[PDB]
RNA sequence: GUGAAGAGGGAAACAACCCAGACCGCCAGCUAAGGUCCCAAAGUCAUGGUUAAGUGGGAAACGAUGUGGGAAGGCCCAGAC
RNA sequence: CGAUGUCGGCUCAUCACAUCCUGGGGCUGAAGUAGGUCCCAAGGGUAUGGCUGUUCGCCAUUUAAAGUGGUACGCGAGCUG
RNA sequence: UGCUGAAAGCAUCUAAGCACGAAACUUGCCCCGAGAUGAGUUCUCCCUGACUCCUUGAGAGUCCUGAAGGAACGUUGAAGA
């Protein structure tokens, strides 16, 4: 199904051969089922959990409600996942990070660290045009960004600068190293996206 | 096979069909005399 | 118009029946159901079966016709049972059936495991030979044309999967 | 001496159904355009919407003649940098048999605000069940 | 001949092409070109055929047991193809 | 002509298919390897240098390939000159 | 490329019918996405006081109550012009 989980920096793992192996510290708490969607209701089979330790002040009624429904405690902020139609959850059960000590890689989904504006050379790999040589006031900048007359227009998803990260992306397929029960932790190979701190959707690698 | 627009019967046992709207000139004998088209 | 003026005869044990124009045609060997076209016109006349062609409808005697050249296949297929005899020419070849899975190795590097669809008996007299019966021509005939397609002959040795009645023809080096 | 208009607020609109089955495209499209628009009732006025609500079920199930089932294509462009999307007939009807319907009567609708307005009063349906059962929809053909 | 110096209806849009020459008004009727299932006024008109290619809705030499009409020309009961 | 900045390079591209590579096939004077030609296929990919303002071209060395074209012989209110 | 099979005693991959068949096409992978005005669903939360007036209209008031929640303000950020 998959989990959600904070980034807590990066580390190696040396192996006694020899191979450090750099991997992503996921601390990965009881992630508790907040509510089961189904066919009958929603049209889709699905669950919603919650993690961490909201201050009740914090939480407005209309989601301290919510949790009252379930029986749960107010974590901080709420996902979903789709069920694989054979398994089956109920509501206020705690998912725990044991369920990926059967899997070997493992899709992440983050959200990645903002840059801000950023021009084109840092956003869409652009080349800087001819440092001197007689150019005036054009190193960094795009060139043309069109033809002519035929279109007389720029045509739509044309590489531009603009807003560079803070966007949700994915790092598939990364494989798990350890799996830490007592901690809570969940070692994965490689780097995920966004910062220490932000949170993280792990779940079992779709391309098997 | 040949895609020639002018496909014609070459030797004798070769044999005309419209196969999907298309005229073929299909063969017995000799595969080279297989060809579509017009 | 030639075919479809010349009745099919049905003998004893051959249960048919016209559902409209779905035809279902019993026997010892299988039991066959065809849904024919709309353009032909079916009926029993005493023992034998009669195919005429319907008025207002453009091409009727090529549509009855077929319909007569069918139900004769299917008549003959229920009855007595079609065969095809494939042979495997070439040295390393080997065919083996167990059960209804025909396993082929043509000189692959993974040996093929050719299934059969609806009730077609798969036999080998010899390794090298596949005898595969059934009451369809259709599906035999399909069968056949896959386990001949995974090796075609080799028109230079004659390597291959090749039907027993086919000749081939081969040609030198040059 | 200032003729009759359809003043909206007056306008007695009915319901209708329409079973699709086996029904010629574009036969259906356009006797459905005529109605959607008001033209068979004789307080016709072109700028008032006065035309019946109909519920087209069964939309999947209609004919085309031909080979227009694999051959007629439905083209759009996505408004994208060389984005021109193509769809037959059956593949079509595979994703969204609502579509075909829609798009053949709203080609046989009028171009603006009212001819809108006027295609909002169709509701096509794949499934035989329809749920404005409250409305009292009588039969059509 | 038309435009130039001529509006109006048609030919999708289209000075010169087809129809036709605006003195002004009317919420009258008959017709021209061109049209009449829907966008959009009027035939889902009548009868007899053709077309299966979406031809209609761009094109040649040449190619083809496509498919309709015809007018002829080669054989039978000694039973031809 | 009361101004539509004209070659080449850089930057940025985009479409066509008459396909250079990669994918699937027919014939072959196709033993295999490698081709030859033809057919379908535009998803992605498609040199760095020497010389010259060059486009092109020749040459050296790579590459699976180093495609042919349209886009004001794309792109100067983007650069160069 | 085939299978069965006419029209056309046969023959032939097709006219009924039936299987295969590629980086193309539709999904599958990632992202945005109900302003999808056709504005979908689930879940939770909050408001349960009176009087006038008239053209008794989805009306206009007059005090009284001000919730859930939000914004504003502050300390700020691996968010940001
Ligand atoms: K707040
Ligand atoms: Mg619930
Ligand atoms: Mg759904
Ligand atoms: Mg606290
Ligand atoms: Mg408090
Ligand atoms: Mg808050
Ligand atoms: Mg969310
Ligand atoms: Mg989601
Ligand atoms: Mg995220
Ligand atoms: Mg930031
Ligand atoms: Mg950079
Ligand atoms: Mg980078
Ligand atoms: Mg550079
Ligand atoms: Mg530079
Ligand atoms: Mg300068
Ligand atoms: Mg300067
Ligand atoms: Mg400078
Ligand atoms: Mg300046
Ligand atoms: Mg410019
Ligand atoms: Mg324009
Ligand atoms: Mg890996
Ligand atoms: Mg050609
Ligand atoms: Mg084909
Ligand atoms: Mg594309
Ligand atoms: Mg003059
Ligand atoms: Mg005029
Ligand atoms: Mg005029
Ligand atoms: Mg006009
Ligand atoms: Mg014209
Ligand atoms: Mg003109
Ligand atoms: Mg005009
Ligand atoms: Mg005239
Ligand atoms: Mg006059
Ligand atoms: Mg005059
Ligand atoms: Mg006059
Ligand atoms: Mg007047
Ligand atoms: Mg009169
Ligand atoms: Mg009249
Ligand atoms: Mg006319
Ligand atoms: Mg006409
Ligand atoms: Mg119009
Ligand atoms: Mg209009
Ligand atoms: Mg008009
Ligand atoms: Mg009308
Ligand atoms: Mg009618
Ligand atoms: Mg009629
Ligand atoms: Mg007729
Ligand atoms: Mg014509
Ligand atoms: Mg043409
Ligand atoms: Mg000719
Ligand atoms: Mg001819
Ligand atoms: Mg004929
Ligand atoms: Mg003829
Ligand atoms: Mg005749
Ligand atoms: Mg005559
Ligand atoms: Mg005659
Ligand atoms: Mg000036
Ligand atoms: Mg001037
Ligand atoms: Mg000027
Ligand atoms: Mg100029
Ligand atoms: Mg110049
Ligand atoms: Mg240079
Ligand atoms: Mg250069
Ligand atoms: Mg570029
Ligand atoms: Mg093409
Ligand atoms: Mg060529
Ligand atoms: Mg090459
Ligand atoms: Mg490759
Ligand atoms: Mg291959
Ligand atoms: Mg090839
Ligand atoms: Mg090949
Ligand atoms: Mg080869
Ligand atoms: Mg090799
Ligand atoms: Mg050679
Ligand atoms: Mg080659
Ligand atoms: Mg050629
Ligand atoms: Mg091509
Ligand atoms: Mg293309
Ligand atoms: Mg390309
Ligand atoms: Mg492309
Ligand atoms: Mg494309
Ligand atoms: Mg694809
Ligand atoms: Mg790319
Ligand atoms: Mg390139
Ligand atoms: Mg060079
Ligand atoms: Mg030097
Ligand atoms: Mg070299
Ligand atoms: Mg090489
Ligand atoms: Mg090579
Ligand atoms: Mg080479
Ligand atoms: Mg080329
Ligand atoms: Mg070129
Ligand atoms: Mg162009
Ligand atoms: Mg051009
Ligand atoms: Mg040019
Ligand atoms: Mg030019
Ligand atoms: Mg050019
Ligand atoms: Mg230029
Ligand atoms: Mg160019
Ligand atoms: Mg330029
Ligand atoms: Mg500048
Ligand atoms: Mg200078
Ligand atoms: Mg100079
Ligand atoms: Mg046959
Ligand atoms: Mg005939
Ligand atoms: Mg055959
Ligand atoms: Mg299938
Ligand atoms: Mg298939
Ligand atoms: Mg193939
Ligand atoms: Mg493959
Ligand atoms: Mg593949
Ligand atoms: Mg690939
Ligand atoms: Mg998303
Ligand atoms: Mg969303
Ligand atoms: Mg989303
Ligand atoms: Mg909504
Ligand atoms: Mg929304
Ligand atoms: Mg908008
Ligand atoms: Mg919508
Ligand atoms: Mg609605
Ligand atoms: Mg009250
Ligand atoms: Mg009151
Ligand atoms: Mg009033
Ligand atoms: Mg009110
Ligand atoms: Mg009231
Ligand atoms: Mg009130
Ligand atoms: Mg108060
Ligand atoms: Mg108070
Ligand atoms: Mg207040
Ligand atoms: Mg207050
Ligand atoms: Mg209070
Ligand atoms: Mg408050
Ligand atoms: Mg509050
Ligand atoms: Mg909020
Ligand atoms: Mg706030
Ligand atoms: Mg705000
Ligand atoms: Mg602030
Ligand atoms: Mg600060
Ligand atoms: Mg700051």
Not at chain 3, 12 to 38: C, P, W
Not at chain 4, 55 to 79: F, M, P, S, W
Request: glycine letters at 10%; charged letters at 25%; proline letters at 4%.
């Amino acid at each position: 199904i998959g989990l959600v989980g904070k980034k807590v920096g990066m580390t190696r793992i040396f192996t006694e051969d020899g191979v450090s192996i750099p991997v992503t510290v996921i601390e990965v708490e009881a992630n508790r089922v907040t509510q089961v969607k189904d066919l009958a209701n929603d049209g889709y089979r699905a669950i919603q959990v919650t993690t961490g330790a909201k201050k009740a002040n914090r939480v407005t009624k209309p989601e301290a409600g919510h949790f009252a429904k379930a029986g749960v405690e107010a974590g901080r902020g709420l996902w979903e996942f789709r069920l694989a139609e054979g398994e089956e959850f109920t509501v206020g059960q705690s998912i725990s990070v044991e369920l990926f000590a059967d899997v070997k890689k493992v899709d992440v989904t983050g959200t990645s660290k903002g840059k801000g504006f950023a021009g084109t050379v840092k956003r869409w790999n652009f080349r800087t045009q001819d440092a001197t040589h007689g150019n005036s006031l054009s190193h960094r900048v795009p060139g043309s960004i069109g033809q002519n007359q035929t279109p007389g227009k720029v045509f739509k998803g044309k590489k531009m600068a603009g807003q560079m990260g803070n966007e949700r992306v994915t790092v598939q397929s990364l494989d798990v190293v350890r799996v830490d029960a007592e901690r809570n932790l969940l070692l994965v190979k490689g780097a995920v996206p966004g910062a220490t701190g932000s949170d993280l959707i792990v779940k079992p690698a779709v391309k098997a | 096979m040949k895609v020639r627009a002018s496909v014609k019967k070459l030797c004798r046992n070769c044999k005309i069909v419209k196969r999907d709207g298309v005229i073929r000139v299909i063969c017995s004998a000799e595969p080279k005399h297989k060809q579509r088209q017009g | 118009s030639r075919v479809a003026k010349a009745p099919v005869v049905v003998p004893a044990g051959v249960d048919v029946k016209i559902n409209g124009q779905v035809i279902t045609i019993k026997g010892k060997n299988g039991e066959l159901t065809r849904t024919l076209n709309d353009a032909v016109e079916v009926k029993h006349a005493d023992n034998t079966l009669t195919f005429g062609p319907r008025d207002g409808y453009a091409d009727g005697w090529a549509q009855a016709g077929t319909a007569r050249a069918l139900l004769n296949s299917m008549v003959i297929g229920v009855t007595e049972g079609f065969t095809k005899k494939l042979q495997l020419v070439g040295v390393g070849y080997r065919a083996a059936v167990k059960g209804n899975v025909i396993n082929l190795s043509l000189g692959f590097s993974h040996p093929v495991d050719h299934q059969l669809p609806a009730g077609i008996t798969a036999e080998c007299p010899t390794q090298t030979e596949i005898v595969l019966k059934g009451a369809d021509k259709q599906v035999i005939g399909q069968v056949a044309a896959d386990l001949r397609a995974y090796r075609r002959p080799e028109p230079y040795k004659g390597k291959g999967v090749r039907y027993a009645d086919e000749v081939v023809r081969t040609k030198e080096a040059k | 001496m200032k003729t009759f208009t359809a003043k909206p607020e007056t306008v007695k609109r009915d319901w209708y159904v329409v079973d699709a089955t086996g029904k010629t495209l574009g036969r259906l499209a356009t006797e459905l355009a005529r109605r959607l628009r008001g033209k068979h009732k004789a307080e016709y006025t072109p700028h008032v919407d006065t035309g019946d609500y109909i519920i087209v079920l069964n939309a999947d199930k209609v004919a085309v003649t031909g080979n227009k089932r694999t051959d007629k294509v439905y083209y759009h462009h996505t408004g994208h940098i060389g984005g021109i999307k193509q769809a037959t007939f059956e593949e079509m009807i595979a994703r969204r048999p609502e579509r075909v319907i829609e798009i053949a009567v709203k080609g046989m609708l009028p171009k603006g605000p009212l001819g809108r307005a006027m295609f909002r009063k169709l509701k096509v349906y794949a499934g035989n069940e329809h749920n404005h059962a409250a409305q009292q929809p009588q039969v059509l053909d």
